Design a protein around this ligand. Sequence first.
Ligand SMILES: [Cl-]
Ligand SMILES: [Cl-]
Ligand SMILES: [Cl-]
Ligand SMILES: [Cl-]
Lengths: 168, 166, 168, 166
Amino acid sequence: AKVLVLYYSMYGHIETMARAVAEGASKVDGAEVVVKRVPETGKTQTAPVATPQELADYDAIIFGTPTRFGNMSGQMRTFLDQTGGLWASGALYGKLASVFSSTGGGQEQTITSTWTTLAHHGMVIVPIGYAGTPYGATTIASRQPSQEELSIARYQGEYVAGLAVKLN
Amino acid sequence: AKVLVLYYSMYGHIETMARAVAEGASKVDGAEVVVKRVPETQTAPVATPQELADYDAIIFGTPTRFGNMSGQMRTFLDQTGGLWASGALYGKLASVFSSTGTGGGQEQTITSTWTTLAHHGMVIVPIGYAGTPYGATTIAQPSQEELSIARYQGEYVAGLAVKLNG
Amino acid sequence: AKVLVLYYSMYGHIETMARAVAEGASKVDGAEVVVKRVPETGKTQTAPVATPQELADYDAIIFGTPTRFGNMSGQMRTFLDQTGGLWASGALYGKLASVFSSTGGGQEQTITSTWTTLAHHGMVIVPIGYAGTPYGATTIASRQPSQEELSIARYQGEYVAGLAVKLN
Amino acid sequence: AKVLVLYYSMYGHIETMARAVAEGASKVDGAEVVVKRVPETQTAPVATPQELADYDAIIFGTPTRFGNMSGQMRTFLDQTGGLWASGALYGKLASVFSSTGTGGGQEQTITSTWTTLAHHGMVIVPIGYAGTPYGATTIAQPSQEELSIARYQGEYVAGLAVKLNG
Ligand SMILES: [Cl-]
Ligand SMILES: [Cl-]
Ligand SMILES: [Cl-]
Ligand SMILES: [Cl-]
């Protein structure tokens, strides 16, 4: 029922993707969707900035990040480093997680490496399959996200939100 | 909810692990648990790729070969193209457990397995810290501790399968 | 000096890529380039079929495979499974390895997972960087490889062959 | 050939490993070996990202945090965008060694590091079977066996650097 779309955006492209994720999630009856960004560690930033413990308030979190050499961005990594207190209390255990990314190639490695990080919190991992990448929505970022990439982002939000409602 | 524990065992270590996973799953009210093994190239019946569509959750057990899953499990999964094209496993729960191999690689075996299951659109369930948080493992002679974690994994995934299905 | 381009091709697309790799390798003075395929485990197959121990005769091997769910193809995997005798004698130790792939997404995982397999043989791993993916040449396969994808394949052969000559 | 052993150490375990790698590298005729550490947030000087361009081979040492490299090494590598854009590390030799962390993950740390270095077009050198074939590791109190493997890794990579450069 409560779905957080949490992102870092350098150029606005992940932000555009995150708003498409959120639009998709909002199509689901019973899903309460909120959009936040992680602090800086350029396009003017838009969404409210999240604090680490806010994550515990959500049933699903959909994480959006540009790649940095096939890893999540330093900004999202630093934010997730500050979830040690959540880890020590089992706060995020069993909550749904899903990820979307943009280039800065490496998009697949960015997603799968993020999964491993979130598995340490015991989060349930939601890929999107054939419905690429199958691991999560991605974009190639001057070039803006295509309508096709945004449709896949919208799908991902909708799918994850439905799973959240089914579970909670 | 129907839970399949699907495994390949070379030395009996993964068989023992699979039985522990099934024991945990069988503790869950409303979970129907079956154990099968993949064909070669043990009491559990051998699975066909087609029957995987019948289950709400599948927990996959495999030995490690040079940092990835065993050839037997990989060959089996290689033959799920028809399932893939029809979306037969889409949205189903998946979880993985493994055995170490020469040069280690049990964590890698699990995360590599996740990649394959993500192509099928399966929902992936790690065990976290409630040894690796990715799934139950054995450094095999599985220890009582390792079996206790395998039991937890079955109970946890079967509970999730019942909560989302019945 | 001796460079093997070894592939499996289901639809001809990896074959097309492999011949571009080989063309690139052949541009290097002092590189002796040979193309072979792994046995079946459709377009009519062209290149001679390799046997596992032939790999020991080469200074560099450039491996081409379609993806199967983000792993190398069953055909290339089965072939590489039959290199246990090479492994036990240290036959492939220190030789150059590089990889290219095609979809069947998952292209990045196919390459990086192949690397881990070849690291068990102690092979030196050659990615291509920015010169995506940075991990190796790839194509999206009815659709044939684009001239851009083939140029990257050609680059990869040329680069690996030069490293082979520099080393041997 | 100039070889840099670049590391981050929390408890001294990776420092001891880095010194073993450097000892192995220093056995190689024509290899010039230097040890530096990445900045925080020990006798070895602290490295700047810019100076990595000066070396023929860089052997990276890091602890593991939740299945990936330490924040300190990752932050350092995060700041190699200028190097990346200019191709400063392209074609240079890279190798990795690591320490285990809570929930394991030392092999994953190495292969994740490989991915980052591949973006820079670095040539990646595993150690094979001459513990994981990906690079030297410690289950830390590094053992004499672990240090012997770290020495081998330095000697092997320095030999390769001399053969392709001088
Ligand atoms: Cl962006
Ligand atoms: Cl076994
Ligand atoms: Cl093909
Ligand atoms: Cl340390």
